[PDB]
């Protein structure tokens, strides 16, 4: 690495409610809430009705302090920097009597020269965190109107004034925990001569024959002299040097601008998940002065082109991603913060989340603008998992101020996070905000303000999202796409805009439209659509006592932030299922419903390629125990929707789709290679296992790369009787020439509430060892949408929420480090027919 010494200021911290003079131990990085929780000074914020009880914290100011030693030799180093990667939010930072910083942007990292304020021996760091409420009450009082941020759960919508995670003020799947604190690491660096303040590896061009890079460095020298040095870039792959370049320089005190070209011939491209390996080079830049490496910095670098094509075309305006020259149908989801308390999210939780996306066959995630610019670990994981990232700037669902001061603050976050993130292979585009132009045009805001205020809001929209933010992107990340908003034009209520750019089709849910509307109401790229579900009972039990197990109990409503959500789920459930009586049965069928309905959408979007070029459902994940649109609950349990997403995103999908009493079958592929001389084979099977008719075979089919194509159509009438349809399913398999199976599907001709489901019994044998449970499942009769339920949080299943077919044995593997030999894991197996008598 280099001759610098880094000291982690991560222990010895204490905190205090300002005004009390009482100091208690603190954890940094961390938050006021966690620190309080860890001394039992707050109840569990996620439990029961506790949300109301923790609100008092946002009205107090909080102080934090620590002390640390600096030695004589440490004090003699040339430079000493103090780095705050995150302060949330209005924080005055004091060191040995000196005010170093009045911080006012959660999303900005601060690097402070501190050599002249440091002392031999003991040093004292104090940080005063003004309440971001108290701090903004006068600002709001001067404003003369309330911004219409309904997700800000307070009479006064103060979120919009602070550069601070929007969701912390509340959201419609969120708890309001307006927290403060040192939310990312604090480090102190003791170094010689200079630091590298920025290292940008800029791809000038990429062909199969050659990668042309420009290594741009900003080096800040802290000593007065003219310093001869040698700048060195080593490019290596898997530990072996690929190319090495050098440059003699003489460094001047202060800032220096150095550029070295580097070329990799016959580069190995980074490819996204499902297209091959996410290959990552190592680039290390070094500043050498004689024998010492005084500063080194490295990046992992993926060589690839990404181009968002947004052009007028026959169908409206396209919106798709072209990766290393090939149009890539995008498959993934909208990501929210994983916790009400950000520093509580662990390295392992990040790691598991990327595993969840990778195993569901996703190749994209959108970091939605109500959360944060994610940490370095998140983008590193997207890099090495081949997951493309759409990064919103942090504006959502409301217009925002656009005064000169507010814009300067935004500019500093825009530049800070662009430079932090621009070397990530995963980083695919920037989006100015979520839904704000939609809000301004369609959400009935004009009726809420005077014409003068509203016009000032429209002009204010332009200065931020059409001027400041695109300008910053153009300046600091000139090869990446920027768009002002998502969706940029299309509105789900306006059929004529559907062919223009991306869509948030909230016609399902908000517009109450049936899932089948997804087959007809098509976008050029679905950047959001979603449906709510209650999480499973083990997650319900984490916030509710069994006495509260009612849809409309007070504790249950405390965990449903959509006021129409419960009835809407019931309205949709009646359309496809028999609504059961017990709460447990409802929750289970609520899971099946969300998974089945959303998957039909994902299918439609893939099937309808190239007119549609992507689908990102709302939402991946949860920040706490709550009813939401997620596919994975707060504890990391996959909902049915996550398994269904995996299936619907499989690189090769057989997609039977039934409309107007007729069945077509499409074969859908995101493989880069064409498959030839394939056979689709299908057979109707009743609920006892008995074939009806013989095998239908379709031979000599080609499945071309990156396409969706009809290969079969047949009417239902004369093909099968109305009664058959209620008592049988269609099995589909796709095999190569030799007869090797590459894909499988099952089709039902009727809605589940109309199937004549047999009362049946699912038996299983279990072999349990340390960390693993291996079940073999049996039912002589079809068992519909089965849910293998265990009480163990975060338990992972090879599969779940699948139909168990008559007489067909099924092996399911469950893993968890909590599983121990000689300790029967409890299993409860539910299926549709059991939910009614």
The listed partner (Cl ion, ligand M2F, Br ion, none) that binds 397, CB under 5 to 8 Å by sort, is ligand M2F
Beta bridge partners of 681: 697, 733
Closest CA to 353 of 131, 631, 570: 631
Considering the rule CB under 6 A, would residue 506 count as an interface residue with ligand M2F? Answer: yes
The reply on whether position 397 binds ligand M2F by CB under 6 A is: yes
Using the minimum distance from each CB to Cl ion, give the nearer residue, 196 or 367. Answer: 367
Give the interface segment with ligand M2F, choosing from 169-177, 282-290, 311-319, 716-724 (CB under 6 A): 169-177
What is the per-residue binding string for Cl ion in 176-215, x denoting contact by CB under 5 A? x---------------------------------------
Can you spell out the DSSP letters for 48-104?
Answer: TTHHHHTGGGGGS-EEEEEEEEE-HHHHTSSEEEEEES--BSEEEEEETTEEEEEE-
End-to-end CA distance of the chain: 69
Please select the residue that binds ligand M2F; options are 434, 491, 596, 835, rule is CB under 6 A.
434
* Residue 510 interacting partner from Cl ion, ligand M2F, Br ion, none (CB closer than 5 to 8 Å by kind): ligand M2F
Q: Near ligand M2F by CB under 6 A, which window of 165-173, 185-193, 374-382, 735-743?
A: 165-173
**What is the C-alpha to C-alpha distance for residues 184 and 569, in angstroms, rounded to an integer?**
39
Partner that binds at residue 94, options Cl ion, ligand M2F, Br ion, none, CB closer than 5 to 8 Å by kind: none
Structure tokens at 506: 């909230």
Going from the C-alpha of 564 to that of each of 437, 510, 511, the distances in angstroms are: 24, 9, 12
Q: Pick the closer one to ligand M2F by CB: 274 or 565.
A: 565
Contacts of Br ion in 47-106 (CB under 5 A)? 79, 81
Q: Residue 507 to residues 73, 123, 295, 490, 637: CA-CA distances in angstroms?
A: 66, 59, 55, 12, 28
List, as one string, the DSSP characters of 245-278: EEEEEEEPSEEEEEEEEEEEES---B--TTSS-B
- The 410-449 site mask, x for binding Br ion (CB under 5 A), equals ---------------------------------------x
Does residue 719 interact with ligand M2F by CB under 6 A? no
Q: Of 122 and 661, which has the nearer Cβ to Br ion? A: 661
Provide CB contacts within 8 A for 808, sequence distance 6+: none
Q: Is 108 helix (H, G, I), strand (E, B) or coil?
A: coil
DSSP string covering 167-228: GGG-BTTB------B--S-EEEEEESSEEEEEEEEEEEEE-SSEEEEEEEEEEEE-SSS-EE
Residue 470 binds: one of Cl ion, ligand M2F, Br ion, none (C-beta under 5 to 8 A by kind):
Br ion
4, 123, 131, 151: residue in contact with ligand M2F (rule CB under 6 A): 151
What is residue 573's three-state secondary structure? helix
CB-nearer residue toward Br ion: 475 or 554: 475
Residue 123 or residue 623: which is nearer to ligand M2F going by CB?
623
Q: Rule CB under 5 A: say whether 184 interacts with Br ion.
A: yes
Q: Which is nearer to ligand M2F, 283 or 629 (CB)?
A: 629
CA distance 710 to 713: 8
**Which residues, in sequence order, are CB contacts of 530 under 8 Å at separation 6+?**
506, 508, 509, 598, 617, 618, 619, 629
Residue from 12, 25, 113, 325 touching Br ion (CB under 5 A): that is 113
Residues in the chain: 837
173 contact, one of Br ion, Cl ion, ligand M2F, none, CB 5-8 Å limit per kind:
ligand M2F
435 interface partner picked from ligand M2F, Cl ion, Br ion, none, CB below 5 to 8 A per type: ligand M2F
Convert residues 138-157 into a mask of x (bound to Br ion by CB under 5 A) and - (unbound).
-------x------------
Q: How far is the CB of 2 from Br ion (least distance, A)?
A: 16
CA-CA distance, 588 to 578, in Å (whole number)? Answer: 12
> CA-to-CA distance for 685 and 683, rounded, in angstroms?
6
Interface residue with ligand M2F, options 13, 169, 173, 617 (CB under 6 A):
173
Task: Identify whether the C-beta of residue 682 lies closer than 8 Å to the C-beta of residue 731.
Answer: yes
Any idea what the Cα angle at residue 414 is, between residues 412 and 418, rounded to 5°? 120
Site string for ligand M2F, 587-626 (x = CB under 6 A): -------------------------------x--------
Name the residue whose CB lies closest to Cl ion: 371
Residue 167 interacts with ligand M2F (CB under 6 A): yes or no? no
Query: Taking Cα atoms as reference points, which of 628, 625, 623, 635 lies closest to residue 165?
Result: 623
CB of 486 to ligand M2F, least distance (A): 9
Which residues in 261-290 contact Cl ion (CB under 5 A)? none
- Please answer whether residues 399 and 439 qualify as being in contact, where contact means their C-beta atoms are separated by less than 8 angstroms: yes
Q: Give the containing element (helix H, strand E) for 241.
A: strand 240-251
3-class SS at 435?
Answer: coil
Residue 719's Cβ-count burial label (10 Å; 0-12, 13-18, 19+) is: middle
For residues 120-159, which are near Cl ion according to CB under 5 A? 153
Exposed e or buried b for every residue in 591-618, given b needs 16+ CB within 10 A?
A: bbbbbbbbbbbbbbbbbbbebbbbbbbb
- State in angstroms the smallest separation of the CB of 619 from ligand M2F: 7
Q: Name which of residues 743 to 802 contact Br ion (CB under 5 A).
A: none
Q: Which of the listed partners (ligand M2F, Cl ion, Br ion, none) does 115 bind, with a CB threshold of 5 to 8 Å by partner kind?
A: Br ion
Beta-sheet strands, E only, within 556-690: 614-617, 652-659, 662-669, 675-686
The residue from 58, 85, 104, 172 that contacts ligand M2F (CB under 6 A) is 172
Binder of ligand M2F out of 63, 296, 435, 519 (CB under 6 A): 435
Binding positions for Br ion, rule: CB under 5 A: 79, 81, 113, 115, 145, 184, 375, 449-450, 453, 466, 470, 484, 658, 661
- Interacting residues with Cl ion (CB under 5 A): 153, 176, 337, 367, 371-372, 438, 491
The residues of the shown chain that bind ligand M2F, judged by CB under 6 A, are: 151, 171-173, 370, 396-397, 434-435, 506, 510, 618, 629
């Amino acid at each position: 690495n280099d001759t610098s010494e880094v000291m982690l200021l991560d222990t010895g911290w204490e905190f205090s409610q300002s005004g009390t003079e009482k100091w208690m131990p603190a954890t940094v990085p961390g938050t006021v809430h966690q620190d309080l929780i860890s001394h039992e000074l707050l109840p569990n914020p996620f439990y029961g009705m506790n949300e109301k009880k923790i609100q008092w914290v946002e009205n107090e100011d909080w102080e934090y302090r620590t002390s640390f030693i600096v030695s004589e030799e440490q004090l003699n180093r040339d430079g000493i920097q103090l780095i705050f990667e995150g302060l949330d939010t209005y924080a005055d930072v004091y060191l040995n009597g000196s005010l170093l910083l009045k911080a006012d942007n959660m999303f900005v990292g601060y690097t402070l020269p501190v050599k002249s304020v440091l002392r031999k021996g003991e040093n004292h760091l104090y940080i005063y965190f003004h309440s971001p409420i108290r701090q903004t009450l006068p600002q709001y009082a001067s404003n003369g109107f309330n911004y219409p941020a309904d997700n800000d759960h307070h009479e006064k919508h103060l979120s919009v004034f602070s550069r601070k995670a929007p969701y912390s003020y509340g959201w419609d799947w969120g708890i309001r925990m307006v927290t403060s604190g040192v939310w990312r690491p604090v480090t102190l660096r003791f170094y010689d001569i200079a630091t590298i303040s920025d290292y940008y590896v800029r791809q000038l061009s990429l062909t199969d024959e050659n990668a042309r890079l420009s290594n741009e460095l900003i080096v800040n020298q802290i000593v007065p002299q003219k310093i001869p040095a040698e700048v060195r870039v080593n490019v290596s792959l898997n530990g072996t040097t690929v190319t090495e370049v050098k440059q003699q320089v003489t460094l001047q005190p202060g800032i220096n601008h150095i550029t070295l070209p580097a070329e990799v011939t016959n580069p190995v491209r980074w490819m996204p998940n499902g297209w091959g390996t996410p290959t990552l080079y190592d680039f290390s830049a070094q500043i050498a002065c004689g024998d010492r490496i005084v500063a080194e910095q490295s990046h992992r670098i993926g060589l690839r082109t990404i181009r968002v094509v947004n052009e007028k075309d026959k169908d409206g305006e396209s919106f798709y991603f072209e990766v290393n020259g090939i149009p890539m149908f995008a498959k993934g989801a909208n990501y929210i913060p994983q916790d009400a308390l950000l520093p509580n999210v662990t390295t392992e939780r990040y790691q598991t989340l990327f595993r969840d996306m990778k195993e569901a066959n996703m190749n994209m995630v959108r970091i939605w603008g109500g959360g944060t610019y994610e940490n370095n670990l998140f983008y590193d994981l997207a890099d090495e998992n081949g997951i493309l990232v759409w990064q919103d700037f942090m504006f959502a669902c409301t217009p925002y101020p656009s005064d000169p001061t507010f814009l300067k603050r935004v500019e500093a976050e825009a530049v800070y996070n662009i430079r932090r993130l621009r070397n990530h292979a995963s980083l695919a585009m920037w989006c100015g905000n979520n839904e704000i132009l939609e809000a301004l045009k369609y959400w009935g805001f004009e009726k809420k303000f005077t014409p003068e205020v509203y016009q000032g809001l429209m002009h204010g929209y332009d200065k931020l999202f059409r001027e400041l933010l695109p300008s910053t992107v153009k300046e600091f990340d000139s090869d990446r796409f920027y768009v002002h908003s998502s969706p940029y034009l299309a509105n789900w209520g306006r059929p004529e805009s559907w062919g223009t750019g991306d869509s948030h089709n909230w016609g399902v849910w908000y517009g109450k439209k049936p899932f089948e509307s997804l087959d007809t109401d098509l976008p050029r790229f679905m950047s959001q659509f979603g449906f709510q579900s209650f999480p499973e009972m083990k997650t319900i039990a984490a916030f509710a006592a069994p006495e509260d197990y009612q849809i409309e109990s007070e504790v249950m409503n405390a965990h449903q932030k959509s006021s129409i959500g419960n009835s809407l789920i019931r309205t949709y459930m009646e359309r496809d299922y028999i609504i059961p009586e017990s709460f447990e049965d409802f929750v289970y069928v609520g899971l099946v419903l969300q998974g089945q309905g959303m998957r039909h959408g994902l299918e439609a979007h893939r099937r309808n390629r190239p007119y549609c070029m992507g689908t990102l459902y709302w939402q991946l994940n949860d920040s706490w125990p709550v009813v939401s649109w997620s596919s994975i609950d707060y504890y990391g349990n996959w909902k049915a929707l996550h398994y269904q997403a995996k299936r619907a995103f499989a690189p090769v999908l057989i997609n039977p789709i039934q409309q107007n009493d007729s069945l077509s079958v499409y074969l859908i592929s995101d493989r880069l290679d064409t498959m030839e001389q394939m056979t689709l084979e299908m057979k109707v099977v009743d609920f006892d296992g008995k074939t009806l008719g013989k095998k239908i075979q379709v031979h000599s089919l080609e499945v071309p790369a990156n396409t969706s194509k009809c290969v079969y159509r047949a009417k239902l009438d004369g093909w099968l009787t109305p009664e058959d349809c209620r008592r049988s399913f269609l099995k589909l398999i796709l095999k190569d020439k030799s007869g090797h199976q590459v894909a499988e599907s099952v089709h039902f001709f009727r809605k589940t509430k109309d199937l004549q489901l047999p009362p049946t019994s699912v038996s299983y044998q279990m072999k349990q060892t340390d960390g693993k449970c291996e079940l073999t499942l049996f039912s002589s009769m079809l068992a519909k949408d089965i849910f293998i339920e265990t009480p163990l949080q975060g338990a992972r299943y090879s599969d779940n929420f699948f139909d168990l077919l008559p007489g067909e044995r099924k092996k399911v593997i469950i893993t968890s480090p909590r599983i121990k030999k000689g300790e029967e894991l409890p299993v409860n197996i539910k299926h549709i027919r059991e939910t009614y008598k």
